Design an enzyme around this catalytic site. Structure first.
Site, PDB file in Angstrom:
ATOM      1  CB  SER A 173      47.553-105.763  15.472  1.00 41.77           C
ATOM      2  OG  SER A 173      46.594-105.087  14.675  1.00 41.77           O
ATOM      3  CE1 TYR A 186      51.835-104.504   8.520  1.00 40.15           C
ATOM      4  CE2 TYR A 186      50.248-105.786   9.774  1.00 40.15           C
ATOM      5  CZ  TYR A 186      50.775-105.391   8.556  1.00 40.15           C
ATOM      6  OH  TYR A 186      50.248-105.879   7.395  1.00 40.15           O
ATOM      7  CD  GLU A 222      44.632-106.529   5.668  1.00 41.14           C
ATOM      8  OE1 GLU A 222      44.401-105.463   5.027  1.00 41.14           O
ATOM      9  OE2 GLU A 222      45.700-107.198   5.569  1.00 41.14           O
TER      10      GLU A 222
HETATM   11  C1  LIG Z   1      56.102 -99.920  -4.914  1.00 44.39           C
HETATM   12  O1  LIG Z   1      54.867-100.633  -4.668  1.00 44.39           O
HETATM   13  C2  LIG Z   1      54.953-101.750  -3.941  1.00 44.39           C
HETATM   14  O2  LIG Z   1      55.014-102.855  -4.425  1.00 44.39           O
HETATM   15  C3  LIG Z   1      54.954-101.479  -2.477  1.00 44.39           C
HETATM   16  C4  LIG Z   1      54.970-100.203  -1.926  1.00 44.39           C
HETATM   17  N1  LIG Z   1      54.901 -99.963  -0.611  1.00 44.39           N
HETATM   18  C5  LIG Z   1      54.803-101.050   0.176  1.00 44.39           C
HETATM   19  N2  LIG Z   1      54.720-100.834   1.515  1.00 44.39           N
HETATM   20  C6  LIG Z   1      54.779 -99.483   2.077  1.00 44.39           C
HETATM   21  C7  LIG Z   1      53.386 -98.945   2.301  1.00 44.39           C
HETATM   22  N3  LIG Z   1      52.645 -99.841   3.192  1.00 44.39           N
HETATM   23  C8  LIG Z   1      52.158 -99.435   4.379  1.00 44.39           C
HETATM   24  O3  LIG Z   1      52.355 -98.309   4.805  1.00 44.39           O
HETATM   25  C9  LIG Z   1      51.318-100.381   5.172  1.00 44.39           C
HETATM   26  C10 LIG Z   1      51.774-100.857   6.396  1.00 44.39           C
HETATM   27  C11 LIG Z   1      50.965-101.643   7.193  1.00 44.39           C
HETATM   28  C12 LIG Z   1      49.679-101.984   6.787  1.00 44.39           C
HETATM   29  C13 LIG Z   1      48.787-102.726   7.696  1.00 44.39           C
HETATM   30  N4  LIG Z   1      47.880-103.648   7.275  1.00 44.39           N
HETATM   31  C14 LIG Z   1      47.237-104.129   8.400  1.00 44.39           C
HETATM   32  C15 LIG Z   1      46.224-105.067   8.559  1.00 44.39           C
HETATM   33  C16 LIG Z   1      45.749-105.304   9.838  1.00 44.39           C
HETATM   34  C17 LIG Z   1      46.286-104.635  10.931  1.00 44.39           C
HETATM   35  C18 LIG Z   1      47.328-103.717  10.766  1.00 44.39           C
HETATM   36  C19 LIG Z   1      48.006-103.112  11.961  1.00 44.39           C
HETATM   37  N5  LIG Z   1      49.117-102.402  11.762  1.00 44.39           N
HETATM   38  O4  LIG Z   1      47.551-103.310  13.090  1.00 44.39           O
HETATM   39  C20 LIG Z   1      47.807-103.440   9.474  1.00 44.39           C
HETATM   40  N6  LIG Z   1      48.780-102.565   9.013  1.00 44.39           N
HETATM   41  C21 LIG Z   1      49.233-101.535   5.548  1.00 44.39           C
HETATM   42  C22 LIG Z   1      50.041-100.746   4.750  1.00 44.39           C
HETATM   43  C23 LIG Z   1      52.572-101.202   2.649  1.00 44.39           C
HETATM   44  C24 LIG Z   1      53.972-101.738   2.396  1.00 44.39           C
HETATM   45  N7  LIG Z   1      54.764-102.328  -0.237  1.00 44.39           N
HETATM   46  C25 LIG Z   1      54.848-102.515  -1.560  1.00 44.39           C
END
Ligand SMILES: COC(=O)c1cnc(N2CCN(C(=O)c3ccc(-c4nc5cccc(C(N)=O)c5[nH]4)cc3)CC2)nc1
Length: 340
Positions: free
Chosen positions: A233, A236, A317
């Site tokens: 965490s 992020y 997670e």
């Molecule tokens: C175009 O498609 C892609 O390949 C692609 C598109 N968009 C992406 N990305 C954009 C969308 N994504 C997210 O908003 C995202 C951000 C953070 C997590 C997340 N995971 C956690 C696990 C444990 C704790 C925590 C915490 N903050 O305590 C966590 N937070 C999850 C999701 C992900 C990144 N990445 C890749």
């Protein structure tokens, strides 16, 4: 009138300096698109441009149907690209950065619209009770056991320093959460974010991604994601040594029957019976050491083997798909001391 460290907290999460700096980072044109000019039509509508763009990332539209789309994104969210022609949004690596960009802009917009409309005054608009937990106390001591004890060794870029420990009750959450307060398997888990987002978090709670937002990057779909090791965490917070002060939450999340997966499903509707998802990690805190505040799991044992081979996660997670399944308990002010 409030205590000093709470007055500093509000000057941290409403700092218009931080917001402008966070857009010069993302290469946004502050001449065409200043803070005030950020409206909620646009981000939803920019997200919308990162439907169609993604809607032809796997088919690959061809520039005949990309150029106009990649173009029409910059009508709403202008950018300032040194002297090199604008990076054309025709890959999932690009649309990732822009996914994370609007993800951030949305809460920067919240922070301004609160500050702009109608430091005790900015506290009012957070609609959250913020009280200082005192260093020498017990409540203070079992939060620090959790921070020092569940530091993961893969996360060796920084030592973790606790500055201030705040207690938080957001208006309306207690009522929203009564329905889940009687659910089994409730955990005080970690949730890190950019301090520019915390205006949005405290005011609106932790939200799930809008439906306009892209497919994938979302390992276990659009939900509220928690960890049991602070480092995961902590990461992020996206803190550099330029700004070495982060904010990480503790949440009570009512997990009930955890759906236990070890690789990505873009979970759209949870199985009848399940209440949360549990990404199984390689490492998990000593379950021996798991302590109990008020009928809530505080898993603050140190990293040992889960034993579990055949996961794509180094660490667990937790994801819920209902904002009401979270009840935010503390907010931590951390210093990131870095190692190189
Ligand atoms: C175009 O498609 C892609 O390949 C692609 C598109 N968009 C992406 N990305 C954009 C969308 N994504 C997210 O908003 C995202 C951000 C953070 C997590 C997340 N995971 C956690 C696990 C444990 C704790 C925590 C915490 N903050 O305590 C966590 N937070 C999850 C999701 C992900 C990144 N990445 C890749």
């Amino acid at each position: 009138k409030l205590p000093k460290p709470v007055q500093d907290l509000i000057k941290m999460i409403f700092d218009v300096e931080s917001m402008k700096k966070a857009m010069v980072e993302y290469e946004i044109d502050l001449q065409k698109m200043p803070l005030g000019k950020l409206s909620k039509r646009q981000i939803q509508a920019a997200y919308s441009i990162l439907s169609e763009v993604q809607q032809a990332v796997s088919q690959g539209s061809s520039d005949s149907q990309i150029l106009d789309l990649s173009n029409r994104f910059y009508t709403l969210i202008p950018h300032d690209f040194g002297m090199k022609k604008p990076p054309l949004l025709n890959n999932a690596d690009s649309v990732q950065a822009k996914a994370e960009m609007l993800d951030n802009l949305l809460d920067i917009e919240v922070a301004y619209s609160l500050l702009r409309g109608g430091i005790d005054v900015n506290y009012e608009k957070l609609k959250t009770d913020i009280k200082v937990v005192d260093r020498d106390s017990e409540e203070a001591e079992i939060i620090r056991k959790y921070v020092k004890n569940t530091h993961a060794t893969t996360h060796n870029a920084y030592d973790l320093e606790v500055i201030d420990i705040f207690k938080i009750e957001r208006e309306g959450e207690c009522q929203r959460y009564k329905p889940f307060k009687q659910l089994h398997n409730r955990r005080l888990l970690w949730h890190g974010s950019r301090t520019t987002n915390f205006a949005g978090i405290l005011s609106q709670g932790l939200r799930i991604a809008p439906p306009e937002a892209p497919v994938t990057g979302y390992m276990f779909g659009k939900g509220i994601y928690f960890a049991d090791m602070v480092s995961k965490s902590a990461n992020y917070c996206h803190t550099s040594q330029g700004d070495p002060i982060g904010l990480i939450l503790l949440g009570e999340v009512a997990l009930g029957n955890m759906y236990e997966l070890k690789h990505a499903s873009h979970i759209s509707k949870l199985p009848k019976g399940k209440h949360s998802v549990k990404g199984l990690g390689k490492t998990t805190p000593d379950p021996s050491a798991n302590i109990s505040l008020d009928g809530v799991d505080v898993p603050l044992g140190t990293g040992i083997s889960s034993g579990v081979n055949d996961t794509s996660l180094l660490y667990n997670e937790y994801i819920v798909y209902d904002i009401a399944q979270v009840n935010l308990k503390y907010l931590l002010k951390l210093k990131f001391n870095f190692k190189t």
